Design a protein around this ligand. Structure first.
Ligand SMILES: CCCCCC/C=C/CCCCCCCCCc1cccc(O)c1C(=O)O
Ligand SMILES: CCCCCC/C=C\CCCCCCCCCc1cccc(O)c1C(=O)O
Ligand SMILES: [Cl-]
Ligand SMILES: [Cl-]
Ligand SMILES: [Cl-]
Lengths: 127, 127
């Protein structure tokens, strides 16, 4: 199966509605990759909104704004999956589960662009 | 209307099939924006394949690989729509229409990730 943009979305849709509390680590690791790839499909200007929506959904305090944003920024700028690998090792299983579940749900709802000029023009094309 | 990843794909699907000869400059300009945004949803490592697929579809020789790749590279690394705007100025309508039609078609079929480790993992998640 070819990993097109659409296939990537469809995959996120499926796993967003799954109970992943008792999946294998092999699939959990892949889901983290899915989150990283998806993060890089958003403009860097949307990371702050992604962080905001994450805090809101999971009911985290504003004290977690800095660390949650950092995770998204370093995923967005990750190369060779070095940070993604660190995140896997450093965090426990449950923490990764909740983070992944949150993102997959958020990602499908948030716009991938913030630029007003770009958004204004793209809205004229939407069927 | 919310410019999500899915909305972006649906807009590309629609306009890929449209005969965009005789359309207004406003919408033709917006389509160029769509191409630029869509280009940056591909990993840098896929630009070479995007170029190759472009040439083959349009029936161009390999002598056109360098100029076509340059366009995709500069769209990919564009900031503030600087290069995007220069394309509009420099290019004629037909050169721009042919490029847009070409891209919108090929983009929906090609993978947005090349890294075998990423692809291998994401493949295990596809429903
Ligand atoms: C049973 C033990 C007592 C429990 C109650 C008292 C202990 C409180 C902290 C225990 C972790 C719960 C999540 C809160 C931490 C925010 C997420 C985070 C931040 C930074 C590094 C991480 O590695 C993580 C992470 O992995 O979650
Ligand atoms: C097995 C060999 C590894 C050693 C190789 C060389 C050293 C370092 C590798 C790269 C960073 C290693 C993790 C530490 C920094 C990212 C961890 C993180 C992530 C997200 C939020 C955080 O708040 C944090 C955090 O504060 O830790
Ligand atoms: Cl941490
Ligand atoms: Cl902990
Ligand atoms: Cl004009």
């Amino acid at each position: 199966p070819k990993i097109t943009l659409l296939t990537l979305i469809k995959t996120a849709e499926h796993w967003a509605r799954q109970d992943i509390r008792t999946i294998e680590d092999s699939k959990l690791r892949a889901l983290l990759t899915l989150c990283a790839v998806m993060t890089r499909k958003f403009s860097k200007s949307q990371l702050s909104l992604l962080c905001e929506t994450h805090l809101r959904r999971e009911g985290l305090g504003q004290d977690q704004a800095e660390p949650v944003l950092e995770v998204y920024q370093r995923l967005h700028s990750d190369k060779g999956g070095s940070f993604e690998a660190a995140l896997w090792q450093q965090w426990d299983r449950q923490s990764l589960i909740m983070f992944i579940t949150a993102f997959l749900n958020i990602a499908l709802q948030l716009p991938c662009e913030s630029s007003a000029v770009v958004v204004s023009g793209l809205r004229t094309l939407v069927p």
